[PDB]
Every structure is written in C-alpha cells, then in structure tokens.
Amino acid sequence: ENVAELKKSFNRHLHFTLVKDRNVATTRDYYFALAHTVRDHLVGRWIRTQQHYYDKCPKRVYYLSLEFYMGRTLQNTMINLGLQNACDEAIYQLGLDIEELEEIEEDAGLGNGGLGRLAACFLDSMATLGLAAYGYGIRYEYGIFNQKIRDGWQVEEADDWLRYGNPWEKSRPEFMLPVHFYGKVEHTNTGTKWIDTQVVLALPYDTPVPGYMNNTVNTMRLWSARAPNDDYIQAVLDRNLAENISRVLYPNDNFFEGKELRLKQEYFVVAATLQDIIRRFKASKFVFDAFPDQVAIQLNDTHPALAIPELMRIFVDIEKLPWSKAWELTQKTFAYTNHTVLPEALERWPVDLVEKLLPRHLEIIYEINQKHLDRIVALFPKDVDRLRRMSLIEEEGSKRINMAHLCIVGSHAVNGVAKIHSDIVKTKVFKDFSELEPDKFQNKTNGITPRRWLLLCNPGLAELIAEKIGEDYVKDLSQLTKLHSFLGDDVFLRELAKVKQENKLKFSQFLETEYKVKINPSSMFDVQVKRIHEYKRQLLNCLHVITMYNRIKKDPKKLFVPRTVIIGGKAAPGYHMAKMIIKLITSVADVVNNDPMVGSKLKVIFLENYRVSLAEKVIPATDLSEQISTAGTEASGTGNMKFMLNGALTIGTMDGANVEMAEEAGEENLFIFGMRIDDVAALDKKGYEAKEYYEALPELKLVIDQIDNGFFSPKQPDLFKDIINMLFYHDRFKVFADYEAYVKCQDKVSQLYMNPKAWNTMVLKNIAASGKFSSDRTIKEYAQNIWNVEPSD
Amino acid sequence: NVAELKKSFNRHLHFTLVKDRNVATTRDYYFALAHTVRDHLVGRWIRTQQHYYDKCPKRVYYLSLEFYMGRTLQNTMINLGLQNACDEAIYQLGLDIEELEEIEEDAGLGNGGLGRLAACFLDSMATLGLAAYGYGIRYEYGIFNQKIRDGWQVEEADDWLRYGNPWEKSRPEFMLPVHFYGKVEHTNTGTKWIDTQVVLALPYDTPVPGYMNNTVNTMRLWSARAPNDDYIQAVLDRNLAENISRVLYPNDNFFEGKELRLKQEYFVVAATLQDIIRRFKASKFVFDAFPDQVAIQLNDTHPALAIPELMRIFVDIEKLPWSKAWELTQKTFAYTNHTVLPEALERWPVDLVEKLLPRHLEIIYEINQKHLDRIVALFPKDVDRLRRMSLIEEEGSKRINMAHLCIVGSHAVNGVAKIHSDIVKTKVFKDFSELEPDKFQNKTNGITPRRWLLLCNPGLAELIAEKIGEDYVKDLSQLTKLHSFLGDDVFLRELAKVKQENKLKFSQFLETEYKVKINPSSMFDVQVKRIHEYKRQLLNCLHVITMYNRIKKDPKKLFVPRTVIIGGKAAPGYHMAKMIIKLITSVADVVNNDPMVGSKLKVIFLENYRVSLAEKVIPATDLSEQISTAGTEASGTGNMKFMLNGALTIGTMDGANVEMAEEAGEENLFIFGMRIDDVAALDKKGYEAKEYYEALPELKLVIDQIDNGFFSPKQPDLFKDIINMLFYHDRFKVFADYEAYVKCQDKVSQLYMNPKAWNTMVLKNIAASGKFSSDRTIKEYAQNIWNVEPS
Ligand SMILES: O=C(N[C@@H](Cc1ccccc1)C(=O)N1CC(C(=O)O)C1)c1cc2cc(Cl)ccc2[nH]1
C-alpha cells in the first residue's frame, strides 16, 4: 500500500486483468486497473470481518430496502481505507490524472432520492461503527434513468450502468435461491402447501462496505433475477420475462404506482432475503427461539412489507412452528421506518392482485388482520368505526391492503425520520395504533455520512477543520461544536471563505464547460437540487427568479448582489406537472441568461442529471441552500444536512429536519420563512383562494402574467397553461401563500451576503452545529433503541 | 516452476475469488486455476497482435455464425506447455485436477461439424502462425442441453455464461452500430439508407493459442446491445434488440427462414466488415491494397450478406465506383460450400430482405443484373441458362439464392472433401464452374490433433510418442512411422491396452449415469453425430433390432458381445429426428431388459452429445458408424476423429470416408452399400421400399415389430410416422443399404474375434490418418485461396 507498490499493482492489473500496455490502454482501462488495485486492499478484511461475525455471532442487523443510492465507489473506498493520498501520488507518477480516471465510473444509481441515499449513508455508518450489518436489495440492471434536456424538456435515457463491468460486485453462485409466484394453495394434513408456482431464481451479488479506518468491511447483498433451467427459440427468449423482475428501478419518488411488476420486485427481494437470513441463522453456531436475539430486520418504508407475512410463511408452513410462536418471533424481528405522509405515496395493493400473485401471503395477511381486529373489538366493544380505521384491509369498493398497517402490527418499533414527522406519524396518521401501543412509535432523525459528504466531497473543508480541532470529528461529528471557539478568529474566517471560493471556481469550470453560460465566480451560488416535486416547490423558487429578473429589467443600475441560481433534479417519467416545471425553469433561464441588460448580474442553470456523484460537486460550491417544501410535506430531508455541513446557509420553511437544524444552530442563523404547520392547517380550514395573493401582490402578478401570456415561451404562448391552472385552482402546496414571505427572506439573504464577515460567521455557526446530523448518531440511536445491537471500536 | 503456479493460484483464490481454502467451492478452485493459466496467455497475446501490426502480413478472417469451441482450460494448458506443471501444482495443493476441469462449461456456439471445423481451424491457424482471426456471434445460449424424458428428447437452455467466462475479454472501445429496417433514399449526393433502427455490437475477444509456438490469435465474437438514444416498458423493450445474439439456431443442415436468424446473419456481417475496414485504415498500409491485406472466408452461405455489405460500404460510404468496388470484393471473399441437401439451402424471400435490409436488396439486384448481362453476352440464345444462374428465384415466391450470391462475389469456391467438391463443381454449380473452372476447388476437412488426440486421449498420445517421438503432433503425416510396428505383438497389446483403459474409464461414466450394466468385454459400437434422416441412425437401429431377433432365436450361438451406443441432438422442430430417438430409447428398453439377451448386447442412447462428451466416448470406441447415404455427407469429421483414436470404421463411400479408405487401404475399413452412381441409378429407376421388405425376411420382422407395437406395447402405432416414411418417402434409401450393411456388420464381428488382426487393422488406420489433420487443411487454404504464409 505504499506508492512504489501501488504503481506495480496498477501495472500488473493493466497487464493481466485488462490485457493492455501504455500504448493501447484506454482511460476506462486505467480506471479499471486502479479500481482493481484498490479493490485488492478490501479482500483480507472482508473475509476476516464476515468470518468474525460467524465465530462471535453478534446480533446481526439486516437493512432491507428496494433502494441503495450508492453513487461511485472508487474514491469512497480509497478514503475509508486511508489509501487516497498514496493512490493520488502513484497515478500521478504513472503520468495519469486520478480525478479523470474517477469520472469513468458509473454511479450505482439504484435509488430515487433521500430514501435510497439514507440506506447508502446507513451502510457506511454501520460499517464505521463496527456493527454486524447487511444491506439487502435488488441488483437493478438499470438504475434511475440518465436525464437529458432536449429543447428545454427532460428526456430519459436508460442507465445501462453494468455495460462495461462493475469491479465492485461479487457474484455468489453458491447462495442462489428460488422464489415462487402465482400457483395455488393446499391445506393438507402435513401443513399448507403453496404449489404449481412459477419459479424465478435469485442470484446474489455482494459489494463490500468498508468502514472508515477500522478494518471492518461489511456486505451489501443485491439480488438479480434469473430464469430457472427446468417454439424452442421463443421459449429461450421468454426467459427474459422472469429476468425482467430485476431489470429496472421504478423511478418514482414519493409516489405509489401499483404495477404488478413492482409487486413482483417487492416479493422477490423479500423472499430471497429472508430465506437467505434463515439459512444463515440455521447454519450459525447458535429452535428459532433465539432468532430475534440474533436477527433484526429494518423495513425501509413499506416497500418490503411482504417480509412480515413471508417470515410467518417460512416459520409456519416450512419450519412447522405454531402460529402463536411464529407471530411472537416475527414482531420481535421487524422494525418499520415510515418515510412519508403524502396520500399519493401510500402503498395500497389491490387484494385481487395479491391473491393471484401471492395466494399464500394473502391468506396469512387476512389471518394477521383477524387476530388484529378481534383484539380491538375486545378492548373497544362499541367503536365499530375504529375497527374500520385500523384494519389492514380497505374494503371501500376496490378492496386493497394497507401495507403501512401491516408493517405496524408486524413490527415491535415504528419510527419517523424527523421529530416533527415522527410526531405527526404517531399522533395523527397512526393515532389509533399509538394509543393502543404508546412505546411502539419512535423518532430517529435522519443523518448523512461525514465521509462521503465531507471528507470525500470537500477535502479542503475537512482539512481546514482538522487543522483547527483534529480528526476525531470524522467518527464523532458532534466534535464540530469545538469550531465555536473560532467565531472571532478573522484569519480562520478568511480560510473558511477561501475553501468555499475554491470549490466555487472548480464548479464554475464544470458549469462553463458543460453549459454555454459564463459564470460570475464571485456571485452567490443559490442552489436547489433534489427530485422535482410540487411539494418541494422548485416552482416557488422559479417565481423568485423571475421576480429578480424583472427588478433588474426595471432598475438596471440598482446595487444588486449577483447570483448564479442553480436548480436541478429528475422528474418521474409520468409526472406531468414535474416535467412542465422543468420546462418552465429552462425557459426562464434562456431569457435571463441571454438578456443584455442583466448580463453577469444573474445566471440561471438547470443542473442536468442530478445524482450522487454530481451532488458531491455542487454541494461544496453552494452559498445558499434552498429547502422550501410546504410545511408538513418533507418528512425530514437530508440534502438540507449536506449543505449545512459544507458551508452553505439555508433558506427554508419550518419543515422536516429544517426544524432541528434551526434548533442546533440557532434559528437566527438560518433564513426561516413562511407558513409553519399550524398556518397551513388554518389556511386549509378557511379555504385557500390563490387569486387573493395574485391580486394582492404586484410583483407576483407580473410574474404570473408573464408566464401566462407567453413572455417565457413566445412561440407557444399557452405552453404553461397547466402550471397556471394548477396554481390558481388546484395547488395543494400553497405556492402563492409563501411567495411574499419567501421573497422578503431572499432579500435579507442578499443583504447579509454583502457582509462577508457577518455571512461567514453565520456559516461557521451552521458548520459548528451540524454534528447532530451525522448518520453515525442516527445509527447509534437505531442500534440502542430498536435493534439492540452493539458496535466494536 | 510449480511453486510459482501454486502461488498464483492462491493469489487468485484470495483476490479474484475472495475465498480461502475452508470456504472455497469446487467452482472457485476451477476459476482460480483458469485465471492462473489465463495470465500465461497475456504476454504472447499482446505480442502476437502487436507483431501483426508491425509487419502487416495479410490477415485471414474466418467469418462464421458458429464456433464449437468446447472447454478451454486443458487445451490452453497443453498448447502452452503448462499441463504437467499445473497438474503438479494442483496435486500439491491437495486438489483433484480432473474434478476442477469438469466444472468448465463447453462453449457450445455450434450445432455440429460446421461449427467444430471452425474451432479446429482456429487452433491450426494459430499453430501455423498465421495472422488469423475468427469472427462470429457471442450467443447467450449455445446449442441446448439435451435430456431424455420418458424416452423422448427434451431441451434445456444452455445458459453457459451464468457463472462467468474467464476466457473472453470484452473490448468496449470497439463497439459499433448496426442498422436494420429503414428505407433507401436515392439522392444527388448519393443513395442513402435512412430511418434505420440501430443495435450496438460489443465485441468480446477470446485468445486462440497455437500449439507450442508463442502465437496467440483472436476469436472476436459480437454481442447485441440496445443503443442509448411508457418508460418501464421502453426499458424492458431493450430486450428486443438484445435478442439478436440471444441464442444459436439449433439446426444442423437445415434452412429455417426466420427473421431473427436473418437479423443475426446481417449483425455479425455488418459488425465484422466495419471492424475489418477500421483495422485496415489504422494499419500502416485508397483500398487498392485491401485484398492484399485482407482475406475473408465465408463459412457456408450464412454470412453471404457480407458481399453486398462490403459493396454498400465501398460504394455508399467510401464513394468508390461500382466497377472498382466489385473487383475488390471478389478478390477479398472466398466461399466454402458445406452441403448439397436441398432443405439446407438458404433462399431468403425477397419481401423479407426488402423489409429488413432494403439497400442490400437493391445491391443484390444490381449484382444480379450485371451478372446476367455477362451471361447474355456469352450465350445470346440460352434463355434457360439465365434462369438457372440468377441469384433470384422468381417462381411464385421470389427468394434470393444465397449460394449463387457467394459464388459470383468470391474468387474461390470450395467443397470439403473430394467427392463433394466434384459434385459442387460439375453438378450443382456446373453453369458457373464452366464459366470459371479455376474458381472451384477442394479442401478436404481435417481435425486438430491437439484436442482430438493429445488432449482427449493422453494414453494413445503417450504410446505413439514412446515409439516414434513427438514430431507427429505438428506433422501428423509422421504417424506412418507406426508401420514399423506392424509385426510387433508387444505393441499391439499395448495399443489394445490403451483402448481398454479408455473403455474402462468411460464405462465408469456410463453407469453412474445409466441404469444399464456394461459388458467391459464387449465391442463398443458407436454412432455419435447429430440425429438426421440422411445420417441414418435409423438404419443402425434396424441392425440393432436384427441383432436382438437373432439372439432371441439362437441364444446359444457364439456371439461377439456389443455395447451399442448412439447419441446425438435432434433439432427441436425436426419431427422425424425426434421419432427416431424415441425409437432408439424404446428398442434399448426392450433389448436391455430381455433375460435371454443379457450381457450379449446392450444399447445406450448417449444423452447430450457435445464436444466435451465426444472427447470421452471417441477414444473408447472400437467401431465407428459412418453410414450416411452415398452423396449426403459433404465430408464429415467425426469419421476422422474416430480414425485417429483407434476405432475401425464401418461406412459408406461418402464424404471423407472415401479418402480415409484411400489413405489406409479400402480393405482396412468396412465399406458397404450403394455408391454415388448406384444411388443415382436407383433414383432413375425409382425406389420402392416394399421390395426389400418383401425380399428380406430379417428386415420384414424388424419392421413388423416396429409397426405392430413390439417396441411400444402401451401405444402400438407410436412409430407409424416412421413406417410411413421408410415405405413411401425415404429419400435416403434405408432399406436399399440394409442387406449390405448387415452382412458388413457380420464381417466386423468376425475380425473382432481375432484380436491381433483387429488391432493390426487399427494400427493401419491410425498410421494412415495423417492427412486428416486440420493443419494440412489450413496450409492448403493458406496457399491456394488466401495467399498467406506462416511464421
Ligand atoms: O474479462 C477480463 N477482464 C475483466 C476485468 C474487469 C473485471 C470487473 C470489472 C471491470 C473489468 C474485464 O475486462 N471485464 C469484465 C467486464 C464484463 O464482464 O464485461 C469487462 C479478461 C482478462 C483476460 C485475459 C485473457 Cl488472456 C483472456 C481473457 C480475459 N478476460
């Protein structure tokens, strides 16, 4: 692992592994040679780590999720193994540029957004905390689509991420497992049998998860679907049908699409995972009574809800345990995390679909529900409507299964991902269940890993911090509070601002080479990157942008703090409003960026193909972080945390974790604005009439009229009709209701920005208070209050 | 040495497979050893390709839809001179070398002889140091794995890439786009093919090591990938473009005009020519010198589209004038004809080609117009000559005669054995050969002595080497030196011992798989090849039943016992072939369970015959059944394998059987039945199967038994379709050779009773098989068609 030896290993791989010499090698070949050179460093500790779990049998944690938004692996691995500086030197001596090799790697974009990225941060924190934890998901052949912008509109291109090979994954043939679908059920005198099923094989692929500087390397096991081997041509081609189960990730963020294929993916990952878990338990040097003391399975949202009735199926139908005992061990095994409260995102599978595909699971679900309601009928004999409300089944016409209800009764703990969120989940949405079981509902505020989101993406900052207070903060982020000691340290504030500046220059180079636009390197980088959603409101942001443009058009010489406004994110393919909003933004940017009067005063960029590796670039270069969801809509958020950690100030609503960010850093140190949760409720009751604000606010009217009259789309004056219509008559995210307070807030931001010392002092107060948001703290609370597992430091 | 090989093995097990000894699976050990051996290929492979770039010798491109490679581990260890050392390392590591080798999947990207010939050719060309490349398709599924259920063949997908193939190397930087459908636009800027669907071609290189010479050549196989410009359905529909290289069409000697198959043919052809042209432009070489640097061999008519594709490239893209382009095209291409069976002839319907490849149809018409215009000038009156020589067949359904396209587009056309080449030249393509005599040639097939001797039969190879040295491996003609042992009884017993060892080793195989108990004392009678009416395993079956009915009558007669093995795959849609298999499993059930017969005779249908199995059953064979109707087996190569391995041949004067007889002495082979002329006369006179049936009492019983349910009591008329074919539609004259065949078989048994005489004849066969080395075949191709030299 020294420089001379890394060059030798690199040359060795280029030769024997890539079959090339320095004359014919491609950049991809060099990336692969380096990837293998680094990968070899994981082996020893990966084998030892998994071997140690078997010998000492610590209770294991299984994080079951349909998503793992991993981003790239090369750099992350080098950093957690302490190999980056040496590799950087080696590659440089070989006459190459490691950063260029790094760009060849495809993101493992096996997720949509926060839910999937939370899982990824969790694996890093769990390996860093030394827990015997495993991530279980699906090895999608195609991840979240690559986004292109054509004529101002989003276009989707398949993310063929495995086309050239994934050196970071390991096929595990010996652990293949069969998964069953369809068929029929038989209640024989030897137990109930699920027969005449269609079989799809699940081949597992393991990816190492290195902890930060601790010799621990855990595993991420992703399952891939394969047709079993018992017109000939057509029969062989049809093998594709089974293989389509793990073909592509469903691209919806916070939205439920009840497609049968999605249901197939859900049972696929759940069946393979649990059978693999039980297999390992049975081989452990451990009857099943100890199962719950040896296994904890965390449900990442309701997507893997079928795991509950699958575990019961295994215990009852296979292991021959009596229902009562099976049920007991089941509840003690599962814990569920609720990640959302938007109606349209709720998973409610029609009973008929479940009956056809998973007949044995439907039966078990009905039983679960029966024992569920019988107990309620007991405690509350009269309340008939209570039974209707707590039922796992919704019989209102098209009968369907309420997966969240199934997760609640089958789990011993249910948690939200931010205080305000967990409160609403416990006291509103699931009141009937929490009153019945107080101690079941918990909170576990989200977090982000400071390796990827600090050390990796912003080395200049990580280094500056380390020089002031040491490196202990990497593994204990609450150590950042020591930074408070430097609030009056002028030289340190200058050093802090220089790091932001350099990040800004570096990213301005990315922008200019990727887009036409000329970037004012000194302007304020106002950023909003996240999935496109009406509730996240990049639309509100767009109104503010148009507002700023008009102010410039009117008073061209007024002292204006220059800005580069960046907005990026993917829209789900079938989400019409989301796609219209993107087109609006690109249209606005085209006018702004090409109007001679504004020039270098204001530049607008719709950041294309926002994904993990691109978040690592833009976040460190950000001055103002846009976290403006309508109060009550963002369960927690985590992008908000990344910006805080990287030196940006936040303009947002009192929503999700924005509330706890305010508590930690001091509310005066964030630009909070708009309606809070109570204001939204009150405005609801009264009835929200969008027209009022439009008529009542002149700057807003001009904006609205311009969008509506074709100012931003001359060739198609009515192009934005749907946006206008939704805004006046169907906006449940009250865009106009926060417009005023939002714009007033934005002006205060510009005011502060003119005061570099005041601005950087507040930045320091944010960075110094960001410690709570490390996923290491989130995982400690999960380990202690839910999984009952302990580290190894 | 051995210490370093063991060290690399442990290094690969650890870093490449992520395992230690107490957790490794047998498959990890195989992969670890494969990687250890593979590393030894790299230096020479890089050097060999670099050398071709540096000295720019003319390059040979063998374009085929099939490469029946089999397993690669052992073959690589042998050709690299590493087997003993690796055998030692694995032994010292406490592992079973044979167990690891059996883990490897056959790369079965071929149907039978056509695809195996390409593989043997790759090995010989690399061993002769020719700058040669193989170009084909990387099918996800090769020829299906065959199982027998209730006596019938059942097919399973050959998912050979499931666990990974260490022997292939993806070459991402050489991915190319291939076009389909679309339309032709005739502009003032020059005719363009527009609005096409695109499919990417990703090449994968597999190294081809020559035997002990530092040469490592390349076999480049193409895999179809969808390009990247309802969302979910759009992503799933990428499966459609990728279906082009999904599976090998399971037909041997049969034309199935499916569209997907036409797509595969254009795919390999389009990717291949573009890549070849790209390599020409990058070389240190206008195009005038293209044919002096490039030779492309068309393996049968399957890649015939390559002729109009090269023209399309030269003309539509490179803007060369038609005349110039056509001249270059003919000098580049050479066509190998592999069959004369009418059902095997590729004739694509014009409508299909126009829909999928409209610009190629226009080009084909043009080539045809210019072609017929020449014929009109040389024979003004001969109207029918134009009809017989046109690439187009206008009768009702217009279709393209791909064979004709290949002939007019090539400078050399060859068959694969004397008898066949003569038929192709003076009969099937008489109007063409008469116009250009020199164009048609012969190149008798061969098999590589590495895979088919040194590897599959180490015992025989060691015996031969002990007596005549090792020079024969690279110069098989040296086998004639074994004649010096014609009298030696010590050598003859040695020879018989080796055969015994193989029979014993293989017998152990047959019983762990089959219920039957083998008589080790018995003569191994083997017919392994694809199930075909023309190959006649049916005739063989008539003999087995004939033999059974003889034992039943005279249980006490002195009889040479036999283990009769017949094995082969039937094309899934080939009904007769499938009936024939059911007939054989049925007959075997009756014979194998009859108390009165017992160890006197046993029958086995060898399931899943394929390259790795062939390597086992061939060296254990005493009698090789090569009985196609005279004129139907263009050449055959299994005949040659058996000859090299110590088996005597019972066969017709067909394909290369004729030449085997010329080399070893007609009396040293058991030749029988009708010859090309006799079949010709019988056809003239008309064939009435009933006659031989009436005239031959042993035959009558055999048939009545089949037809009345003797071999299928549960379903008495099960073989009705077979009876109907033998009597009123048997164009391969099974009954007409029944009598001579049975008599011939009796003579085989006679000689078998005399061990010294039997092995004396084997020696004469092994000593005369030198001609059948693919190394001899390749040299002829090199000198007379491609105009290239070794190194
Ligand atoms: O596949 C080889 N190396 C591998 C190296 C590799 C492995 C994993 C990820 C990226 C690269 C290779 O090039 N790829 C695997 C990818 C795929 O599956 O498409 C691409 C290889 C080396 C080699 C050397 C010889 Cl001599 C013969 C065959 C060989 N294959």
Ligand SMILES: O=C(N[C@@H](Cc1ccccc1)C(=O)N1CC(C(=O)O)C1)c1cc2cc(Cl)ccc2[nH]1
């Ligand atoms: O895939 C790895 N090695 C390879 C080794 C290999 C390569 C080619 C054929 C067989 C085996 C592997 O196991 N396979 C490629 C096959 C496939 O395509 O499914 C199976 C590998 C090694 C490794 C080491 C670490 Cl630390 C992490 C991930 C890793 N993957």
Ligand SMILES: *Cc1c(COP(=O)(O)O)cnc(C)c1O
């Ligand atoms: C962190 C992250 C998210 C979640 O961001 P929010 O602003 O909390 O919605 C989404 N996508 C990517 C690529 C991320 O890295």
Ligand SMILES: *Cc1c(COP(=O)(O)O)cnc(C)c1O
């Ligand atoms: C050699 C070979 C053949 C060709 O056999 P013929 O008897 O010439 O048809 C067919 N299949 C396999 C697997 C072979 O090795």
Ligand SMILES: CC(=O)N[C@@H]1O[C@H](CO)[C@@H](O)[C@H](O)[C@H]1O
């Ligand atoms: C269904 C879903 O994707 N929910 C998302 O989950 C992440 C992780 O908890 C939250 O931060 C975010 O606010 C929320 O929208």
Ligand SMILES: CC(=O)N[C@@H]1O[C@H](CO)[C@@H](O)[C@H](O)[C@H]1O
């Ligand atoms: C079309 C086809 O598969 N033809 C086969 O080709 C091989 C290779 O030349 C011959 O040995 C054999 O007789 C013949 O049947």
Ligand SMILES: O=c1[nH]c(=O)c2[nH]c(=O)[nH]c2[nH]1
């Ligand atoms: O197809 C959709 N995907 C979504 O993510 C979404 N969100 C929404 O409101 N509608 C839709 N539609």
Ligand SMILES: O=c1[nH]c(=O)c2[nH]c(=O)[nH]c2[nH]1
């Ligand atoms: O599907 C078929 N494959 C063949 O190889 C063949 N041969 C034949 O005569 N008929 C058929 N059918």
